[PDB]
Design a binder for this molecule. Structure first.
Ligand SMILES: COc1cncc(C(=O)NCCNC(=O)c2ncccc2O)c1
Length: 167
């Protein structure tokens, strides 16, 4: 038993809710919150901008030190940093950005990072400003992630579509 509340169960291990991931993180304090990161960990907008804003820019300060030491992530890759006031840890995962021409097949590799964590609160990778089809992202999630994932979908209209079209 865990503290996540109000989720619709899609599969044995995947759950989904219409929620603001920032508000959900502040209430649950999960072990892991997933950020929709880019390779530079520049948290300017979308999920990343909202998570970073909720940390009062501490996420960005930590991220800049990470990049200065390690260089950029790979598309499809990830790193574990602090969750600040939102979670114990933040798993920064780089899904392919369609608006940059990145290969959508890398979406499966991106979701594989979730398997290193027993339970996660996460957004749909490559959705929103990353330009992928969220229905496709949900399908890849269900077919790739084997650990317990609680998906927060900000847009109510999208949440209902995602639910109604789920196979
Ligand atoms: C590319 O295919 C698509 C099909 N249908 C919908 C989308 C989409 O992402 N729509 C934007 C949904 N809104 C939000 O996520 C949102 N989040 C936070 C605050 C306010 C907000 O409106 C994409």
């Amino acid at each position: 038993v865990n503290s996540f509340s109000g989720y619709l169960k899609l599969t044995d291990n995947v759950y989904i809710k219409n929620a603001d991931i920032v508000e959900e993180a502040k209430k649950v304090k999960p072990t892991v919150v997933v950020n929709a990161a880019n390779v530079y960990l520049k948290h300017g907008g979308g999920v990343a901008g909202a998570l970073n804003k909720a940390t009062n820019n501490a996420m960005q300060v930590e991220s800049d030190d990470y990049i200065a030491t390690n260089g950029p992530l790979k598309v499809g890759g990830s790193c574990v940093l602090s969750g600040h006031n939102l979670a114990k840890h933040c798993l920064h995962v780089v899904g392919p950005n369609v608006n940059k021409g990145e290969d959508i097949q890398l979406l499966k590799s991106a979701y594989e990072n979730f398997n290193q964590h027993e339970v996660l609160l996460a957004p749909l990778l490559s959705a929103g400003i990353f330009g992928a089809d969220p229905i496709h992202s949900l399908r890849v999630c269900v077919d790739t992630v084997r650990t317990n994932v609680y998906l927060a979908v900000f847009d109510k209209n999208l949440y209902d579509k995602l639910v109604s079209s789920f196979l």
